Amino acid sequence: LDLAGPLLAFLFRGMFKNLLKEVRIYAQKFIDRGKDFNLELAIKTRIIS
Amino acid sequence: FIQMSVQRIVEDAPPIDLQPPRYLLKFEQIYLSKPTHWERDGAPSPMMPNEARLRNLTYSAPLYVDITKTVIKEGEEQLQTQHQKT
Numbered sequence: 692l693d694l695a696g697p698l699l700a701f702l703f704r705g706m707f708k709n710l711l712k713e714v715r716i717y718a719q720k721f722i723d724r725g726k727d728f729n730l731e732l733a734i735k736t737r738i739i740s
Numbered sequence: 741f742i743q744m745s746v747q748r749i750v751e752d753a754p755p756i757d758l759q760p761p762r763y764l765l766k767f768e769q770i771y772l773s774k775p776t777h778w779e780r781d782g783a784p785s786p787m788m789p790n791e792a793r794l795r796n797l798t799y800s801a802p803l804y805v806d807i808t809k810t811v812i813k814e815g816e817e818q819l820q821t822q823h824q825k826t
Contacts, residue, residue: 696741704749711756714765718758725760730807730823739803 706739713738746770750805761813768806771825775801 693701717733747770756765777785777797792799804825812818 696745699741700745700749703746707749707753711753715756715758718756718763722758722763728763728809728811730765730809730826734826740800 703739710735710738742772746772746803761811763812764810766808766810768808768822771804771806772801773804775799 713735714733718728721733722728750767750770753767756763758764775787777783777787779785787797787799789799791797806822806824807826808820808822810818810820
């Protein structure tokens with residue numbers, strides 16, 4: 692029986708992987724210049740929420 | 741789930757690898773607080789379930805994670821900058 696904990700863990704793994712994927716994409720696009728990198732604008736809280 | 745599984749999911753995720761200089765991202769620990777409003781002026785306030793029911797709010801709590809960012813500039817010094825409560 693899959694209760695709230697396994698159901699939310701399954702639901703959350705993919706969302707966290709999507710957050711990592713978007714951080715990778717944005718960071719790569721911004722670091723192709725090689726200038727700098729900042730985390731706080733590279734993380735989209737809306738994904739998980 | 742909240743106590744074990746979120747930490748396990750965050751930790752078991754592979755470290756982000758990126759690149760010239762090379763950058764690595766690691767997630768150290770997660771922290772959860774009591775449910776709180778983000779009121780429209782930004783002011784914190786504990787949100788009661790009755791108020792969440794009445795105002796059509798969502799009874800949720802913010803999630804913070806410590807992130808360590810290591811930058812390698814090939815100069816033998818890899819600078820790590822840790823960020824608390826991201």
